């Protein structure tokens, strides 16, 4: 194993959990918009190929 890695893991998880509401709201919005752009990849690719 290795004890240092986990404390790093636990410290990292705590730091992420301690983030400000604005930053995590931005992260959620980015994920939502990324998936929204994801769902229509085929049509966009076909239109780009035609153009």
């Amino acid at each position: 194993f290795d004890k240092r890695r986990e404390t790093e893991r636990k410290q990292y998880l705590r730091r992420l959990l301690s983030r400000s509401p604005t930053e995590i709201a931005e992260e959620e919005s980015l994920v939502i918009e990324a998936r929204k752009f994801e769902l229509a990849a085929k049509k966009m690719l076909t239109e780009r190929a035609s153009l």
Binding site: Y12, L13, E27, L30, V31, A34, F37, R48
Partner: protein, 75 residues
């Protein structure tokens, strides 16, 4: 999209344009900026979707103890 962006082609066009071409250009620009922001967030190690792998106890996953059977009967 970034192997050959459309914003390079549109000023150099020799054929009639249409709103749809500009729609596609703006959409690929949005793709690019979203990916750039994703990468910037990942670099700062502030991305929730990326986490270190957690250690797994070898003993627990092998055999069922009495308490776990009691918890099955529980549920």
């Amino acid at each position: 999209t970034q192997t050959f962006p459309l914003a390079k082609l549109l000023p150099r066009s020799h054929k009639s344009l249409t709103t749809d071409a500009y729609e596609s250009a703006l959409l690929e620009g949005k793709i690019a900026v979203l990916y750039s922001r994703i990468e910037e967030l990942k670099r700062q190690r502030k991305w929730s979707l990326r986490q270190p792998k957690r250690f797994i106890d070898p003993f627990t996953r092998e055999s069922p103890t009495h308490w776990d059977h009691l918890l099955a009967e529980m549920k």
